[PDB]
Symmetry: D4
Subunit: 183 residues, 8 copies
């Protein structure tokens, strides 16, 4: 069932820093997924992980509280603490970030189709109102609620560059067409 190695798994290990892959592993394994088999989902979780960390890096020192990359029970503990101190409505699904500057939760998505389609997909799910949504694609487009992009252009710009670089490296090894088909 689970093999000794795949071309995707080895690219993922040489593409993202060891802290990112360590956390995607514990995250996937927390939800009954094996990165050695679900190789495309493995690349997605690492991409989604790195995006969230560059996003929180763009803000001020104490601007964001990182929800993603935590144990699922720890993540709900921080969400509970944020809601019970700010009074913000408790979301139905685990968000990725909390923005202390704007007092709203953020959901971050990475898509290999039109940002228009994923945003509508993610918007029909949340239904928490106060939860901001920010969608990125592997082509360089972004999409935010109220067109409020939270961060400046330059922080958002480097995220788009990272995504296109990942798209090229995946294609140079003939792994992109399978990746895009997975979503």
């Amino acid at each position: 069932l689970v093999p000794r190695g795949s071309h995707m798994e080895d690219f993922v290990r040489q593409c993202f820093n060891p802290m990112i892959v360590e956390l995607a592993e514990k995250a996937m394994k927390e939800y009954g997924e094996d990165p050695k088999i679900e190789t495309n989902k493995f690349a997605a979780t690492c991409t989604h992980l790195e995006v969230c960390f560059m996003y929180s890096d763009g803000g001020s020192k104490h601007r964001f509280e990182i929800i993603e990359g935590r144990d699922r029970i720890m993540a709900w503990t921080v969400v509970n603490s944020i809601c019970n101190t700010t009074g913000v409505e408790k979301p139905k699904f685990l968000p990725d970030l909390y923005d202390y500057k704007e007092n709203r939760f953020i959901e971050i998505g990475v898509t290999r189709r039109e940002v228009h389609i994923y945003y509508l997909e993610k918007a029909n799910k949340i239904k928490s109102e106060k939860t901001h949504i920010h969608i990125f694609s592997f082509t360089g487009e972004e999409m935010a609620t109220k067109a409020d992009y939270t961060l400046d252009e330059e922080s958002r710009a480097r995220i788009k560059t990272r995504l296109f670089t990942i798209r090229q490296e995946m294609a140079s090894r003939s792994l992109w067409d399978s990746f895009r088909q997975s979503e």
Copy 2:
């Protein structure tokens, strides 16, 4: 008298970073208290320690001078130096911080009752006038002299989140009711 371990002691060691617990130990031991017996006071000193360090983190680079977390004789040495260079009145009790931006000493308190009650308690003690007071609770309320909160909202907001997280983790192990009763 002193045992090999307690449920509170093991939670404190897995909740605060090793630098905080190392300093609460040397602090408690400096005042004839054993963290292995006074387990609730041990959790209080670590909580009070972490709050003071996040507080000084919110300010500018050279904004604060940290008084708490020092040897009691070293702490009075820095207080003497601050008074003898700024001319500020020497406090009767050891404060936690000194604010170079506002030229006042800060006393920081953490309570498991109403911030209204602790503040009045801490205010009747100081009687140093120029010493600012900033009270936090485990429910998310704060209380400052003149309603001058020194730091911005976001720095104060994350402190409240940390406190509520500690309250949850203490309750998940059935240790909160004893902790709240200790104060």
Copy 3:
């Protein structure tokens, strides 16, 4: 189902070094077990992990090849390499160590009952002949095949001391009676 914390989980985190608990987690999670729920099995895996590492520490520089503490598919890869170079019969179950000095696989067990009973239990399972068995208990007894204890007295002696220390610390927090009942 899975909680925020247990008394066993917090003791395990303050008892074993962070590398051991990190590996027991990835190991348990590899086999569909949550250390946050299976708290006793969590303590067992960390105990069994630390024993195997002190055991390989007793030997010479290049004496042992560590099988335990690897990804289950990586562990079989090393077993395959050892069998295909030494010609040793391939075991039916994953062993813990390989001894280059004696050219045999080692299975290491830790018991909270009589070493006599566990050894007979582990012996009826293996049926690989060339696989050595070495059993330790939390009372200070050991038991090896052919009474060949592989390591000297002093290396085996410190392992017994570590086990009895763990037994005391578990009892000082009233967690031993539940632990012994789990096996």
Copy 4:
């Protein structure tokens, strides 16, 4: 052909930090040049390398994307990603930096003749329009397109000081006259 050591090579190793010389080596070797023979070009690549890193240091946190100091195929990958997300025209030659704040590529040159002459030399080559040019000399002069110097005075000032220091140390060992003649 290639010797065991030269006076220039030993000065270069004691003048630039080990990360700079490691990267100039991999860079020169990528283009069929031996730093042990092409000793002057070795000093030039290290000087040009250190300038580019102080330049990107002057900007904001996420201001610049460093193109220089990468594998030549990786450098074109980042250039492709920057062009395909910002829409900027793809340069004909590899630039040194990309400025997210001003949305333009930067070419950085270091000269031992008049900044007037090198700039005209570098300008006739690029012909990419949107590529900014910033020229420094070992005498303390600089020269930028549209006289847009991108960075403030103080960041540019320390770069000039570093260059003059390198010029002195090269002269104190009687190696400057050969270096200036190489360009």
Copy 5:
């Protein structure tokens, strides 16, 4: 009562490595002693601490179990584990080391009088029979039970050199006469 600094305290901090003084502090404070006041006892505890660590360094890899330098309740836990696995008689007083090679506890003493006198003093106290005693002096003499010196000459020789060096440095600052009078 407790001052800001003493000549002995500053010499102790510049004479022993920071790990030794950190442990003497926690040890003295565990027994209601202030190193800032009991300055001579502070130097004694650091000397006695460093001797015990060089002693365990002389043996083999797994030869010794270090009892000194632990929390007093942890130290009794290891003693209990050693007795309950080796069957050795439980000592009445906390020893410094346990020797796995010779299966006996070791008490290590450092004296500023005749090794003859201290040994008789320490021998009348123990009355545990199986507890070995090894006495060192600041003049270069040693004294062991049965004249069994456990370690070779060279390991014992360097310990004597360290002690005489400490005696010289204490005398060069005119602090030795007070130190010798303290014992």
Copy 6:
């Protein structure tokens, strides 16, 4: 002539961080002075060293160029580079800092008498016009040319506190009266 240790030398080693004392040693030794004999001058050089480093810390990222704490021949090399790129007049004596923001050299002095007296002393020596002077005392007073204090209040305030702390610690060991008499 040169002894094994002095009370001042041991206080200096426990008062300043190891990087400061390492540099004062190489500095004093560069000018034919032994820190083991010239113990007061040793404390002065470490105090003067730490002041210069906190001063450059108060500014912006690339604001200052540190002249003090370099080899005397390296220090003149940087001074030459600064003069030959900014066109500033070359000072007659080695300054401590260069301020890129204000384009002037800074001379920093620490006194145990009136800042009024030392400033007049340092001013009669320089005669370089463009060289700024900033004097601190161990009592909390400061004195700058044109009353241009270069840095804000809070950065200057912490320097005064550090100086008064050093004055107290020197007095608590009865070493201040000799120190003040040395200047």
Copy 7:
């Protein structure tokens, strides 16, 4: 010509430690080879590199002098020094190791065919007499001159296991058949 990535290159980066691949790169580049194109030769150089380092690890502390993994001009410098101090005949080709215990140079080879064939190949080339040869294969066989295997069984055994593991991981990604065909 040179691409952005290959399946072999990514496996090599996830299989050998970063120090090994860094040195194979500088080695291949020293001889006009690109690891991004010569992917199989890249895997060979890393395999040959790791073997040489485990080999020198098997000996005593000062037993071996490592020739492989050095700059080609530095390697001849050490060879010259070894010959001119021991009087050993200078080899015609660069060897991998020098054995101080047996006073002979060692050439280490790794083959994907019969050790019988490679040894005869390497033996016809050297013609230095005093140069020892030690051949390993990816199947677990070894072959040494005079059947003098220099190291013990256990050190040689782990090298064979490492080689077979590499053979499996290469096959699990369908890269072995191309690798074996390259030699």
Copy 8:
């Protein structure tokens, strides 16, 4: 008088590890010598320093006490401690090592002439009888008292190789003829 740099100084900094050159500097400066002027003596002190450290590395764990590389007053303190504990006669000149295994001081010399001549030179000076002498040359010869070479062949062999390598690198930059003439 003292310049900004010399060809010898830059070779010395790229030839010996930073700890060696740092100690030769403090050593030379302790005796009124500038490594920036006395460039040949600078290379000699670093060579002599590295030899002494490889020598003590050849022995057992606690075999040697390193006298060289200490402050001159600290070195006499250790010599005093060694004499006053072992009873060995106090040498007239500072030796380099003390051998606990053979209970004798060692003087280590490095020569660029015949080991026969330097040994006779060093022997006429000591006149301490119990002080061993061990002479090395840059050609690969050694010379010890009673032909007692203290260490085995392999430890002494690598020292000779290091010396010949240094001789080659000095010659490749045309610096050897001046170095040999200095002695």
